Each structure stands twice: as C-alpha cells, then as structure tokens.
Design a protein around this ligand. Sequence first.
Ligand SMILES: [Mg+2]
Length: 506
Amino acid sequence: QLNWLHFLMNFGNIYANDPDANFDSIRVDADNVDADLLQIAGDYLKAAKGIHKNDKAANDHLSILEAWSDNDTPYLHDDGDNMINMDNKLRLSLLFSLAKPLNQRSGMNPLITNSLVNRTDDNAETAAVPSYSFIRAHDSEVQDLIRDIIKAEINPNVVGYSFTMEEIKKAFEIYNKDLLATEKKYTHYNTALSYALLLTNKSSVPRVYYGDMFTDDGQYMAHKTINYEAIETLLKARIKYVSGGQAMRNQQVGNSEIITSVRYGKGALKATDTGDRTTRTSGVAVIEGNNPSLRLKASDRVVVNMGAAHKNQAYRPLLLTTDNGIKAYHSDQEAAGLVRYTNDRGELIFTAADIKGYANPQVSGYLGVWVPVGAAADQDVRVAASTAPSTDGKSVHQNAALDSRVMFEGFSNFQAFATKKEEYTNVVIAKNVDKFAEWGVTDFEMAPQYVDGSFLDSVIQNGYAFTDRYDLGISKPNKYGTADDLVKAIKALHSKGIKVMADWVP
Ligand SMILES: [Mg+2]
C-alpha cells in the first residue's frame, strides 16, 4: 500500500506536527517483489523528493530494495536507478572466500571479480550501476545458527523455529562462546577482513550491521564485540583516507595466495594521476590472506603499487594481525615504530617478515592495512553531492559523493527487551548520535516501529493487521520505546545530518 508509504514519509507531520520528525528514505522490504511496485515507489520519490533532478536530492532520500536477491537489479537500473539493490555476488564472495570454515572456503579471486563491479581496475568517475554491499544483516544467518545450536547441543527434536525462551537463552550462551573461539563450529571467520574490503571498496555504499559491532542478544549498544575496535578504526579511516580509483591484485605466494586492495587517494582515479596535496596524504592499502597456514618463501615479495601521488613516501599501519587478534593504530605517532616506505615507483614491498598466516578469534589468514603518514587530524576526503541537473535519465549515481556514504543497519532481531526507560533502543540512539557521526554513518536503517519476542520477519509481518502498521509505539511502547522516543531519535539523527530509513513492507 502506497498510502501507508505516504503515512510513513509524513509521520512527523501527522503525529508530531514536525517535518523534522519525518523519515527521509525507504527500505522496500519484500518475499517477492512485483516490478510494478518498484516503479510506483520510484515514482513517489521523484514526485515528492525530486530525486531525478540532481544527486543532492537523490542522496538526501537514498532508498534500497531488500529482496534477498540480485534479480531485480536490471529492472531497477532500466527504470532509472530510483533505488539501489544489494550486491549479492559480493556478499557471497565475502561469505565463501573469508567467513566459511576451511573445508568449504573458496580461493580469494571472487572477492575481486564476483561482484556487480570487477575491482581489478576501477577507475570510473561514475560506476555503471549503483549498489549497497554488506556481509551480515538482521536475518542473514543468526536464526538459522540458533536453530542449528539447539538441534545439535540442547534439543535434537525441535520443529522449525518453535523454541522455548530457555532454549534461545542456552543457544546464545553457545553462540557467544563460539564468537570468541579460534576454531568456530557455528559463527563466521574473518569479520574484520570482510569489513576491511567492504569499507575500502570503490563503487558501492557499504552497510555496517549493528550485530558486528555489538552482541546480537542483550541490551542496545550494551556489549561491544571483539571486532568493535577494528571496525570503528576502519570507519574513522574511511572518512580520512578512502578516495580515488581502486586496484585489486591476487598473487600466488609461498604455499597459498594473498590479495591487495589499493585506493589511490582523493582526486586520483588512475594509477598515473598525481593529484594534489590531499591525494598525497590519502589512499590506503589492504593486504589479506584467507589461509592460517600461509608461509612466504624467503624469496617471496608482495609489491603493492600505491599510485603516482605516493612516490618516496612514509606509510604506517592502521590494522595489523597479531598472535591473539588485531592491533589498531589510532595515529601516526602510535605507529611510529613501524614506518615503512614506498620506493621511487610508489610501490610498498612486503616480505615473510610482514605477512604470514594466523589463527585467532578474529583472523583465519592475514590482515594488514596501511595509510600514508601526515594526514591532518581533521582530514576528510568525502565529497558533497552535485546540485547540477542529472543528464543520463538516472536518479542515483555511484560517483565519489555516493561512495562517501555509509549505511548502518541499527538493530538486531534478538535484542533483549528493555528493563527500564534508559535501555529503550530509541532513547539510546538519541543519546549516541555523536558516535554514528564519528563513524561516518549517513543513512540509519531503523527496526520496524509498529506494535513481542519474534525473531522471524515472516512471523512479525503475519502477526500484525494492516491497522497495526499505523501504531508506531502510540497505543503502548514498541520494543524500541514510545512514539515520542521515536520522534526524538529521528530529530537527534537529523541534528547530525544523518538520514533515517523507514521499513516499508508492500
Ligand atoms: Mg526483509
């Protein structure tokens, strides 16, 4: 229903008499999506928000399709890029090359080529097709893993997803211990390696999942994951360093392989571009392996071309793999003891002294990330959207301005129920908006707000009549707080210029 969409996009106007309390954008939350409905949703955004006119209008109302497939990408593209779809091939490359157990783990080449964008050499001012990229989401796998854990370790007779509260309790004890284990029976390997690629890739809007920075269970933002520090470090570095063209390479070395991923720096689309002073102190190198047994030969070298702005230059680590986890460096001074140089050609050179396989709770393989020395404390290589008219018939354009955005899926289906007002998700969001701004979050994907411990979207969406979808914590609190708490959260995100995405189930 399009009149329910109209209500959601005017919730601030209708409930609060306050346009600053309106949602900015739409998550089209499908089973199957009819192409006709995608066209009508696009028509709403063009008529109401003028997204066809220029990138500033489009990027202030950036809307997505969630249909668990790539299938609608051609139709969305042909209909004028009025919303962006997921890059499902890249998600599957991250899952199989990095996250899977060793006996199912793919070679690393798909991380480069098995995507909407072949990132071997991505030098485009504007990518052909816009997208968002992610590794996990609220319904990507946890419900399945909790079922697997209960079936294997607690109750082998369980039918479907019909669990007792005590079964889910016990299953999360096992799940949470597995997150902290080197040898993982259930949970994903190499989360930080997946985020290092997601947050340095060109030509996609990355979406960070709440449950990769905080525990999937327990109170909102109460318990940081072991990967919180690595992911926060990458998010802050993305603002400061991540710009320009991309090169990805895949080298056989010793008994295994590595990939390299380079961004040339702001104002350098090609490896030959020299750019300006800001190009010199931006860009990044990511080095990854997915094999804990990786050992380089004494003669093995990994030569990493940083681009023509980076000849004869000091580099320092951002993230390095250690025996026990990942060390983060928060300044040039903190990394002073590990400075290395590019040569006359702008190449970093790594050896067995730098790269080997590790097995720890965060890494199954290898991660190293390097940034140029000398960035100002306030350096920000993001760019604002153009107000010049769009001239190709498309609304959303995957250019440097869209690449500057970060989406945050700001909920877990398995969050604990608040025991006091201070624990309500929407109260906590309002209190912590400075943190989302620090991370470069531009688009905040909120939980469904209408009026329950269900963790299956199927059960939730079946459990509420069409009138229930107008009750956004109004008749009684939703799981996330009162309607007034929702209004305050939307206004708080707007106070930092962060856009807020409504969950629209057609
Ligand atoms: Mg969905």
